[PDB]
Design a protein around this motif. Structure first.
Motif, mmCIF file in Angstrom:
data_model
loop_
_atom_site.group_PDB
_atom_site.id
_atom_site.type_symbol
_atom_site.label_atom_id
_atom_site.label_comp_id
_atom_site.label_asym_id
_atom_site.label_seq_id
_atom_site.Cartn_x
_atom_site.Cartn_y
_atom_site.Cartn_z
ATOM 1 N N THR A 189 0.995 -1.326 0.039
ATOM 2 C CA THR A 189 -0.053 -0.307 -0.360
ATOM 3 C C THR A 189 0.618 1.467 -0.065
ATOM 4 O O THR A 189 -0.006 2.624 0.771
ATOM 5 N N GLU A 190 2.553 0.748 -0.177
ATOM 6 C CA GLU A 190 2.954 2.558 -0.818
ATOM 7 C C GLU A 190 2.655 3.031 -1.687
ATOM 8 O O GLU A 190 3.610 2.920 -3.161
ATOM 9 N N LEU A 191 2.394 3.904 -1.643
ATOM 10 C CA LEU A 191 2.030 4.871 -2.440
ATOM 11 C C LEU A 191 2.624 6.196 -3.075
ATOM 12 O O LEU A 191 3.470 6.649 -2.254
ATOM 13 N N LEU A 192 3.004 5.595 -4.513
ATOM 14 C CA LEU A 192 4.723 6.773 -4.718
ATOM 15 C C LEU A 192 3.737 6.929 -5.663
ATOM 16 O O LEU A 192 2.840 7.421 -6.725
ATOM 17 N N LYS A 193 4.843 8.098 -6.271
ATOM 18 C CA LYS A 193 4.300 9.326 -7.239
ATOM 19 C C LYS A 193 4.485 9.031 -8.965
ATOM 20 O O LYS A 193 5.762 8.664 -8.952
ATOM 21 N N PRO A 194 3.512 8.712 -9.284
ATOM 22 C CA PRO A 194 4.065 8.604 -11.001
ATOM 23 C C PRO A 194 4.463 9.384 -11.514
ATOM 24 O O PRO A 194 4.063 10.743 -11.813
ATOM 25 N N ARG A 195 5.933 9.554 -12.152
ATOM 26 C CA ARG A 195 6.294 10.011 -13.014
ATOM 27 C C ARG A 195 6.095 10.093 -14.681
ATOM 28 O O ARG A 195 6.299 10.868 -15.305
ATOM 29 N N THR A 196 5.375 8.912 -15.099
ATOM 30 C CA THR A 196 4.470 9.042 -15.862
ATOM 31 C C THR A 196 3.290 8.733 -16.257
ATOM 32 O O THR A 196 3.130 8.065 -15.439
ATOM 33 N N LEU A 197 2.998 8.951 -17.485
ATOM 34 C CA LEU A 197 1.101 7.711 -17.667
ATOM 35 C C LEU A 197 1.653 6.821 -17.124
ATOM 36 O O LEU A 197 0.394 6.310 -16.798
ATOM 37 N N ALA A 198 2.611 6.394 -18.208
ATOM 38 C CA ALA A 198 1.916 5.005 -17.826
ATOM 39 C C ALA A 198 3.095 3.722 -16.588
ATOM 40 O O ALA A 198 2.199 3.485 -16.221
ATOM 41 N N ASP A 199 3.750 5.060 -16.074
ATOM 42 C CA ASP A 199 3.638 4.557 -14.175
ATOM 43 C C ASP A 199 1.963 4.487 -13.464
ATOM 44 O O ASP A 199 2.326 3.945 -13.287
ATOM 45 N N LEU A 200 1.792 5.882 -14.086
ATOM 46 C CA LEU A 200 0.373 6.002 -13.317
ATOM 47 C C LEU A 200 -0.170 4.661 -13.581
ATOM 48 O O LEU A 200 -0.958 4.037 -12.516
ATOM 49 N N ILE A 201 -0.288 3.998 -14.445
ATOM 50 C CA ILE A 201 -1.597 2.837 -15.371
ATOM 51 C C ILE A 201 -1.459 1.563 -14.369
ATOM 52 O O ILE A 201 -1.678 1.333 -13.530
#
Ligand code: NA
Length: 187
Positions: A1-13
Motif C-alpha cells: 500500500t506504499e503510494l508513490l508519485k507516478p513519474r509518467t502516464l505509463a507509470d500511473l497506469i
C-alpha cells in the motif's frame, strides 16, 4: 500500500493496476495518485482526439476488467449532460485547460427544475471524485478559447448511464461510446 508519485502516464497506469488488484477501492488513495501525476502532454497526445461538435471519450486502459481509464477531449463550449454513474466510482483529473463541474441532487418524481447544489472550477492537474451516493453532475468547458483535456477513471466500467433534463428532472437511458481505443479511431 506504499503510494508513490507516478513519474509518467505509463507509470500511473501501472500503479492503478495495483490499487485495483482487489475487490474494493480506496478512493482517497486513487485520488491522491491521480493528483500526483503531473500532466505531460506528449504522454497522452495519442489519445487526445477531438471532435468538432461534442466532447469525445478515448479509452486508454481497461484496468484488467476492474476499471476503464479514458481521456476526454472538450472543444470550446462542449459540455456533457447531467449524468449519473451507474453505481460506479468516477475520478476526473484535468490534463489541460479548465472545466466547470456542476453538482445536482437526485430529483423527485415530480417534474421540477433541477437546482444546482454547487459548482466548482477545476484547474490543471486537479482531481474531482463523484458517485451516485454523492449526487449527479455536469462537466463543461465554458472557455471560448481553450480546448480542455481530462483523464477519467470509472470502476467498475460502464457504457450506459442516465441523462437528466435540468428542466423537468426527467431521466432517459443513454449508451456511451468511445471515439477511440488505444489511440485507434473506432467508428
Ligand atoms: Na453519479
Amino acid at each position: 500500500t506504499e503510494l508513490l508519485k507516478p513519474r509518467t502516464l505509463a507509470d500511473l497506469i501501472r500503479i492503478l493496476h495495483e490499487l485495483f488488484a482487489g475487490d474494493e477501492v480506496n478512493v482517497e488513495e486513487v485520488q491522491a495518485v491521480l493528483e500526483a501525476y503531473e500532466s505531460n502532454p506528449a504522454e497522452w497526445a495519442l489519445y487526445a482526439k477531438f471532435d468538432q461538435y461534442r466532447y469525445t471519450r478515448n479509452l486508454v486502459d481497461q484496468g484488467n476488467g476492474k476499471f476503464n481509464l479514458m481521456i476526454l477531449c472538450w472543444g470550446e463550449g462542449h459540455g456533457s449532460s447531467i449524468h449519473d454513474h451507474t453505481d460506479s466510482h468516477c475520478f476526473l483529473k484535468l490534463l489541460q485547460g479548465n472545466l466547470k463541474e456542476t453538482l445536482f441532487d437526485w430529483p423527485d418524481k415530480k417534474s421540477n427544475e433541477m437546482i444546482k447544489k454547487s459548482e466548482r472550477t477545476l484547474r490543471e492537474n486537479q482531481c474531482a471524485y463523484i458517485n451516485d451516493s454523492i449526487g449527479l453532475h455536469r462537466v463543461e468547458n465554458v472557455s471560448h478559447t481553450e480546448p480542455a483535456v481530462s483523464l477519467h477513471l470509472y470502476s467498475p466500467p460502464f457504457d450506459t448511464c442516465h441523462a437528466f433534463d435540468q428542466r423537468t428532472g426527467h431521466k432517459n437511458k443513454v449508451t456511451m461510446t468511445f471515439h477511440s481505443k488505444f489511440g485507434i479511431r473506432t467508428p
